[PDB]
Design a protein around this ligand. Structure first.
Ligand SMILES: [Pd+2]
Ligand SMILES: [Pd+2]
Ligand SMILES: [Pd+2]
Ligand SMILES: [Pd+2]
Ligand SMILES: [Pd+2]
Ligand SMILES: [Pd+2]
Ligand SMILES: [Pd+2]
Ligand SMILES: [Pd+2]
Lengths: 172, 172, 172, 172
């Protein structure tokens, strides 16, 4: 029951649903990261804000994919959202490392989807991901920049460096 | 590891975590409801908007609970988010009925939490839910109003009534 | 006699000329659809406006293709514009069905052209269609949405439903 | 001699007078803390400002309680204000620890008063404390956040950390 579907493979439709799940899972992970840094015994507001902003971005990405699914005449199918991989996230450095791992996995899923689109001769999908692809590269570059600065600040005054990074790099 | 926790029972802490899960689940359900009404073979924009707005409201509720959890020195614990109970939601009437069922369950969970707060002599919790409690009563009243209007419009021109309700009651 | 042509195949050049013809033909079809709904014995202004707007959009598309043809050093070649397939277009539903058929055919021609561009290793063409491709998907989604609403409104009060759709969905 | 008193127990009236004393004592303690950090041999302006702001807040709280006492037809009774527990307050960390101890004691007194109100079936009192209760939870969370940051900054460059916290966290 679609009267509009054209050149939209069942393979891409399913891959888009899986990507929505991955984006929502990422959003959930960032929600957990954000609130961890808001704990009174962690108390790094710039870090909390950074991850809460990412939770919003990932949710927005999922919503864009869902809009596209309907635009193409595919059917959204939702699965459980697995809880994030940790309950406590360690240091800012630990968290930023986890975030980059997460983003690399999202990026790989985008790359896999683009490849499927190319194999299926689906240029609209290709065009649509173009939005996701650059945004992801920009985000990963930012995270790498952050990680380098966090790492430079460890030294052997780790608490001091963690405070200074949150105060002087992150938005608060 | 909290230096601030005071008069905040482990029972309430756990109940707050469960309530966060219920709110996030509700948000997820509303996301699914919203996109269903955006299908080209359903195509009721006012209904899509209504449920997408509710998805945002429920997410906001979860975020408020998480902020409060940290304010009190409790620790957020996240669980899986179960997928919504249906993949396709039927008519506007079916959907509005499902929504009221969902809201009644959230309201009951709020009532249960307030009762626990009262049993634990936790007035801050009581005060905090006061926000949730009125918002929920207002929302359920609105949904009941909608259901009555949807029901009046069935008659034996169901398609006509569904169109008119979306056009003339819902925001588009 | 071009001093600029580079990586622009004769196959793509010809396909672009054919696409210009298809867009102009579509524009002509929409002109006819628009004026049919302006007949005193049809008199559905929102429908007239919808199709007249599409006539303008298709003409604009042809003009964009012609601009691109010259940008690449190809040579515009015009053919006859075949008259639209009907002189009278029936109900709003009949017309919207005809419109979606027309758009699917344009979309297929765009897809065919992108495939040719990919086969000819012509990335500028690919980039250029990216504009056409999303606009077409958006338009077809809109038409599918319209068709669903028109269909819901037939019931057995067809005149009533046709009036209400024109009044409450379409711009007038 | 009141013509307005209704449902206002002598127990609550007395507890309100004691709470006014506790708030005024807290204000006095914060006055002392503030001026200590303004000493030329301490010289941490952000810390001075933080505690002077709290002195004002506590005085305001006492004034609100006194207004409520009269609104209910109770009679304000003032006792001596005991001098603060220290003449010199040590490091920012020492001071912030003392402040949280002080706030926990105020919060416990508020909780005790709410419990008395509930036992006496005095809902206006309950409503009134609702203002005090959330403000106190917010303040204690802030103090806990501060303490965590101060503690992270000790390291073995304590002077450096104390300076940086005052410069980069506190308002100056
Ligand atoms: Pd924070
Ligand atoms: Pd934040
Ligand atoms: Pd919609
Ligand atoms: Pd919407
Ligand atoms: Pd007209
Ligand atoms: Pd017109
Ligand atoms: Pd000063
Ligand atoms: Pd000051």
């Amino acid at each position: 029951s679609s009267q509009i579907r054209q050149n939209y493979s069942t393979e891409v439709e399913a891959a888009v649903n899986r990507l929505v799940n991955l984006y929502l899972r990422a959003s959930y992970t960032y929600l957990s990261l954000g609130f961890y840094f808001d704990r009174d015994d962690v108390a790094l507001e710039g870090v909390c804000h950074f991850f809460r902003e990412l939770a919003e971005e990932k949710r927005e990405g999922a919503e864009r994919l869902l809009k596209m699914q309907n635009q193409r005449g595919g059917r959204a199918l939702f699965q459980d959202l697995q809880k994030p991989s940790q309950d406590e996230w360690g240091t800012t450095l630990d968290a930023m490392k986890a975030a980059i791992v997460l983003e690399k996995s999202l990026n790989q899923a985008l790359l896999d989807l683009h490849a499927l689109g190319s194999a299926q001769a689906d240029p609209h999908l290709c065009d649509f991901l173009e939005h996701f692809l650059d945004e992801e590269v920009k985000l990963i570059k930012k995270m790498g920049d952050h990680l380098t600065n966090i790492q430079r600040l460890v030294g052997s005054q780790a608490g001091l460096g963690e405070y200074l990074f949150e105060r002087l790099t992150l938005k608060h």
